Amino acid sequence: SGFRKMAFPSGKVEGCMVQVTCGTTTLNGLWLDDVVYCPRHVICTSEDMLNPNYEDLLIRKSNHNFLVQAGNVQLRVIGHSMQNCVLKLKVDTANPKTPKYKFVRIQPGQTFSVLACYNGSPSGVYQCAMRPNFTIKGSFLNGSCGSVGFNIDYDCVSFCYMHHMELPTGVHAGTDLEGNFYGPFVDRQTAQAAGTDTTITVNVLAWLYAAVINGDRWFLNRFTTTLNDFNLVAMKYNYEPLTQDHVDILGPLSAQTGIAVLDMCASLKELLQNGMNGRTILGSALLEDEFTPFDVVRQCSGVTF
Amino acid sequence: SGFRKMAFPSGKVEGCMVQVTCGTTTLNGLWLDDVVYCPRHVICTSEDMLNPNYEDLLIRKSNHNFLVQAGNVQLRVIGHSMQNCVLKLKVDTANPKTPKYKFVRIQPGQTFSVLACYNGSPSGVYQCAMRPNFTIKGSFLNGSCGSVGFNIDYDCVSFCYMHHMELPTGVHAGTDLEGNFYGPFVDRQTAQAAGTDTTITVNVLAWLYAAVINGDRWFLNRFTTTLNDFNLVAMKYNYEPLTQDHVDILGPLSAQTGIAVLDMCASLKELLQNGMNGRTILGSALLEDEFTPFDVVRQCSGVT
Ligand SMILES: O=C(Nc1ccc(N(Cc2ccsc2)C(=O)Cn2nnc3ccccc32)cc1)C1CC1
Ligand SMILES: O=C(Nc1ccc(N(Cc2ccsc2)C(=O)Cn2nnc3ccccc32)cc1)C1CC1
C-alpha cells in the first residue's frame, strides 16, 4: 500500500538525450534514429528572442553552426529543417539506443513524466499534469529547454511534451514533438497570459478513491447528488465541469471500492463547501488534482514496463 | 524556476533489476558484478512468515532452487549465502550494465529515490525520506520486495535501501544493502512498533529557503530567535532538535537568499505557534520535510 506521485522509469529516455549548442545557446535535444529534435529558439541570440524571425534566422544558419554532442562524442550534423517550433537536425548516425516510440499530443488534465535535463545530461524525473490552461507546473532552470515529457506503454515511449519556456509568472509551456505549442503560447520573449487555471475535477475524484483504497475514509458521507447539481457547486470553486465521460472513466475505481461515482461527488461537494476542518487526505491538506484515474489504477495495480 | 519533488534518473538502476524465484515466492533482486542481492524472505512460504527460522530454511535450499531471470536471460546460481536479512546469490555472469556503485547506510532525515519493481521489471520512480523512526512512506504492493533506493552522484550509484515489508500501520521498512534493517524491525509477520515519528526540522528550513528562492515571502517576519529558544519550540511541536551542524549545512542557502539561518528559524517558530492560517507555501498547505538542504541546492542549481 501507500500512494505517491510516481514517474515512469526514465532509462529509455535517458539514452536519447543529447546536448545541442548553436553558438551562444546550449539546450537539450532528443536523438531518435538519425534526427535530433530541439526547440528552435536554440538559434536565437539573447536580443533575437524579443521578436525572432525564425525563417530568416534559420536561413543564416549552416550545419556547422550546430554543435551536437552525445556524451563526449560529437555528432556530425548533415542538415537542418524546421517543423513549427521544433528544430530537426539530421545527423550522420542513428541512435542505437532508440526505443520504440510514438509522438502524441495529450489533452488537458492528462499526466506525464518529465526528465529534466541540463547540457544534455539527465538531472531528475517527476510527474506533471497538463493544466486546463495548457501550462505545466514543473521545475526548470536556464538550459532545461528541450527536456521532454513522456508516458510508457510496456515497451513503447509515447513522447508528448518538449519544454520551451517559462512564462513571467513562473509556469512553463512547450510543444508536442511536432513543434505545436500546447495552448496559445509562442516562442518569443513577450509577455503572455495563461488563461484562468481550473482544477481537474475528474483527477480529484480519482485521488479520493486512491485515498479510500489506502484507508482514508473520513470524508465519505451518505449524501446523494446529480451530475448537474454537483456541477452547479463545482463552478463556484473553479472546478472543471464533470461530464458523463468522466463518470465513465471513474467506473473501475467505483467498482473496486463500492462507492458510486456520484456518491464520491457528494463527498467532494462537502469538502469544497466546508473545507477539510484541519484533517488530511493521503498526507495532504489540499485537494490533489494531478493523478488521473488511470494513474491511480496503475499504482494500486502495479503495472510494469 | 519551480520546485518539485524530484527523483534521480533511474536508468543506471533499471539495468540491475532482476527477478528472483525460490519455489513459491517471486520478488526482485539487485544484480551487481556477479552477485544478486535480494530479501532473504524469498525462501519463505506464507506459513513460515509468522516465525521463520531462516538458518534452517536456507539449509533446505540448494543453488538450483533459485531462479534468477534478467530480462529472460537466465542466470545460473553457483553460490548462496545469507548476510543479515539479505541473500547473496553468486551467479556465473557479471552484470555488464553494472554502474559505478557504493553501498551506503543513510541517516534519518536523508532522502533517496525508490525504483519500485514487480517481477524484476521497473514500474515507477519516486523520492522518499528515511523518517526519524526509520520507516519510509512509500508505495509498495505485494511483490515489490527487493526494490531498492539509491542516490546518484555524477556517475556513482549509492544504494541505500532495499524494501522488505509493510508494517500493520501501512508504513514501510527495509534494510541497507548489507541486510541490516533501518530501525528495530525484523523480517517476520508480527506487529512491531515504530517509534514516535517527528518532523525533520532541517529539511523544513531548507524547503522554506526554496520557497524564498521561488518568490514566496509572506512567512518572512521581523522576529529573530536563538538556537536554544527555537529548539525549545521544536520539542513542543515534535520537531527534531536543530544542531550547529544543521545550521552549517544550511549555510549556502542562507548566502543566496540573504536570510540568516536563525531568522528563518524565527519564521518557522511563528508558523508552528500560529499555524499557516490557510495560506500556502510552494503549493503546500503543510510544512514539508522531505527535501534535504542538498536536494534544494541541487534543484535550485541544476546538478547533473
Ligand atoms: O537563446 C538564448 N537565450 C534565451 C533566453 C530566454 C529564453 N526564454 C524566454 C522565451 C520566450 C519564448 S521561448 C523562450 C525562456 O523561457 C528560457 N527558459 N525556459 N525555462 C526556463 C527556466 C528558467 C529560466 C529560463 C527558462 C530562451 C532563450 C541565447 C543564450 C542567449
Ligand atoms: O508469503 C510469501 N511472501 C511474502 C508475503 C508477505 C510478506 N510481508 C510480511 C512480512 C513481515 C516481515 S517480512 C515480510 C510483506 O510485508 C510484503 N510486503 N512488502 N510491501 C508490501 C505492500 C503490500 C503488501 C505486502 C507487502 C513477505 C513475503 C510467499 C510468496 C508466498
Side-chain angles (χ1 to χ4, degrees), chain A residues 1-75 77-153 155-221 223-305, chain B residues 1-153 155-221 223-304:
Chain A
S1 82
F3 204 69
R4 276 255 188 200
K5 207 159 263 152
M6 205 178 296
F8 290 97
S10 67
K12 286 165 247 306
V13 177
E14 280 162 70
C16 306
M17 302 311 302
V18 298
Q19 169 177 210
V20 182
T21 292
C22 184
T24 76
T25 325
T26 292
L27 40 65
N28 309 279
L30 191 66
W31 183 23
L32 306 175
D33 315 295
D34 60 352
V35 176
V36 174
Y37 309 73
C38 68
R40 66 187 177 162
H41 71 243
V42 71
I43 73 173
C44 297
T45 72
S46 52
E47 90 191 299
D48 280 327
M49 291 287 338
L50 216 177
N51 187 26
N53 192 311
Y54 278 108
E55 316 86 81
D56 287 332
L57 299 172
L58 191 45
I59 281 165
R60 299 204 313 270
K61 290 297 185 172
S62 311
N63 298 325
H64 71 282
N65 299 109
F66 288 119
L67 182 78
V68 171
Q69 191 171 156
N72 279 81
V73 175
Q74 285 144 116
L75 310 186
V77 167
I78 70 186
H80 53 242
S81 86
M82 174 163 68
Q83 180 175 19
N84 309 287
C85 306
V86 66
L87 193 64
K88 277 151 99 202
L89 313 167
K90 201 81 166 174
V91 287
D92 196 39
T93 300
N95 183 355
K97 301 190 198 193
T98 299
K100 207 209 167 283
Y101 73 88
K102 290 176 203 176
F103 289 169
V104 158
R105 179 159 182 94
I106 55 149
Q107 294 285 308
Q110 286 185 281
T111 60
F112 54 96
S113 307
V114 168
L115 182 67
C117 292
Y118 299 89
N119 293 292
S121 266
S123 157
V125 65
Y126 54 86
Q127 194 81 347
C128 261
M130 180 66 66
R131 304 303 311 168
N133 69 359
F134 291 109
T135 62
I136 65 180
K137 305 162 93 59
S139 170
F140 288 115
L141 305 173
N142 266 97
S144 63
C145 300
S147 292
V148 297
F150 61 96
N151 286 281
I152 304 197
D153 203 333
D155 61 351
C156 189
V157 180
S158 273
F159 294 106
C160 58
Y161 180 83
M162 170 169 274
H163 184 52
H164 284 245
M165 72 195 266
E166 177 164 299
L167 306 178
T169 49
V171 314
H172 306 105
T175 71
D176 57 34
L177 266 291
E178 309 212 314
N180 302 117
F181 259 97
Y182 288 98
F185 313 110
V186 286
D187 52 344
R188 79 184 278 244
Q189 184 176 131
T190 189
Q192 291 169 71
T196 307
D197 194 23
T198 60
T199 301
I200 309 163
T201 310
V202 72
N203 288 9
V204 175
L205 293 171
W207 173 79
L208 289 175
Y209 279 109
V212 165
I213 295 178
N214 277 268
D216 283 349
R217 269 163 335 247
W218 58 262
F219 50 89
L220 301 179
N221 62 39
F223 288 133
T224 205
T225 173
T226 64
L227 203 43
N228 191 296
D229 285 341
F230 170 83
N231 280 323
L232 256 289
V233 48
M235 328 279 135
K236 185 267 171 270
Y237 292 91
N238 206 33
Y239 272 59
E240 281 279 289
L242 207 174
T243 68
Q244 190 55 46
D245 276 348
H246 296 145
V247 167
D248 298 347
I249 286 179
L250 289 159
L253 294 169
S254 185
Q256 189 190 337
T257 53
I259 302 157
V261 168
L262 295 168
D263 283 346
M264 192 63 103
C265 297
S267 291
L268 174 61
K269 181 188 293 182
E270 203 206 329
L271 283 171
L272 294 168
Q273 294 176 315
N274 308 338
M276 294 211 195
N277 275 115
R279 302 209 63 158
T280 57
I281 295 160
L282 287 172
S284 174
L286 298 172
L287 299 177
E288 167 70 50
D289 75 339
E290 306 215 337
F291 289 99
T292 73
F294 303 92
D295 288 341
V296 175
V297 167
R298 188 233 318 173
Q299 176 166 171
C300 304
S301 147
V303 178
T304 52
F305 311 99
Chain B
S1 60
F3 202 76
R4 279 254 179 207
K5 208 161 278 168
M6 186 168 321
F8 286 102
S10 61
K12 295 181 159 34
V13 176
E14 291 163 55
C16 300
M17 292 315 104
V18 304
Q19 184 193 57
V20 175
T21 301
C22 182
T24 166
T25 315
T26 284
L27 46 70
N28 309 275
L30 174 73
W31 180 23
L32 305 164
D33 305 320
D34 59 346
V35 177
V36 173
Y37 305 84
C38 76
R40 68 179 174 172
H41 64 66
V42 71
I43 70 181
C44 294
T45 79
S46 293
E47 206 164 37
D48 277 310
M49 290 293 328
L50 188 37
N51 180 231
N53 190 324
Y54 284 110
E55 289 219 322
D56 283 333
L57 289 169
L58 190 53
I59 287 169
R60 295 176 54 80
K61 304 297 182 178
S62 295
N63 290 335
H64 71 261
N65 298 123
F66 290 104
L67 270 74
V68 180
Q69 204 170 304
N72 42 31
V73 178
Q74 284 278 322
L75 303 192
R76 188 197 318 279
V77 178
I78 66 170
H80 65 270
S81 57
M82 187 163 61
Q83 183 183 4
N84 300 307
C85 297
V86 82
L87 209 59
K88 287 144 85 169
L89 310 181
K90 179 84 138 192
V91 292
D92 68 346
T93 302
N95 183 358
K97 306 279 181 282
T98 297
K100 189 80 196 75
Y101 74 94
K102 306 186 229 245
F103 289 171
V104 164
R105 184 163 179 97
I106 55 167
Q107 302 273 73
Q110 287 187 279
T111 58
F112 55 97
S113 305
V114 172
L115 179 71
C117 290
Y118 299 87
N119 300 284
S121 280
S123 163
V125 68
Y126 56 87
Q127 191 80 350
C128 267
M130 178 62 69
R131 301 304 311 170
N133 70 355
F134 294 107
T135 66
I136 73 180
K137 311 162 121 36
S139 166
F140 295 112
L141 313 167
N142 234 305
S144 61
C145 296
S147 300
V148 298
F150 61 94
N151 286 265
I152 294 172
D153 171 17
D155 63 333
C156 187
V157 179
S158 277
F159 294 102
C160 63
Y161 179 87
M162 176 175 267
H163 179 57
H164 286 240
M165 63 192 283
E166 188 165 298
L167 306 164
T169 51
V171 301
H172 303 107
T175 70
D176 56 32
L177 269 300
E178 291 192 63
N180 301 292
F181 266 93
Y182 291 91
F185 313 108
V186 289
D187 48 352
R188 66 184 294 228
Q189 193 198 85
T190 196
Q192 314 173 50
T196 168
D197 201 22
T198 52
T199 305
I200 307 150
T201 314
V202 64
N203 289 6
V204 173
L205 291 171
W207 170 84
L208 291 173
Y209 277 110
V212 170
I213 295 171
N214 278 271
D216 291 358
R217 73 177 194 263
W218 68 260
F219 52 87
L220 295 177
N221 57 36
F223 314 143
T224 199
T225 179
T226 70
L227 196 58
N228 304 119
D229 174 60
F230 176 82
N231 272 337
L232 241 184
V233 174
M235 259 40 89
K236 182 205 219 244
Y237 285 90
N238 283 144
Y239 272 56
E240 281 301 290
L242 198 66
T243 70
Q244 185 59 47
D245 291 330
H246 291 144
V247 170
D248 292 342
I249 299 167
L250 294 164
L253 298 168
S254 169
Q256 193 191 335
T257 65
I259 292 151
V261 174
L262 293 169
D263 287 346
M264 195 61 88
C265 291
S267 305
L268 173 58
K269 172 190 169 186
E270 192 76 0
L271 290 162
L272 290 177
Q273 285 177 345
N274 306 341
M276 275 199 254
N277 261 69
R279 299 165 296 212
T280 53
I281 299 181
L282 272 184
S284 182
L286 300 184
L287 293 178
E288 166 70 41
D289 78 343
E290 301 227 330
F291 296 92
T292 65
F294 287 11
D295 295 347
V296 174
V297 167
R298 163 178 87 245
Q299 173 161 179
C300 300
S301 96
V303 179
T304 58

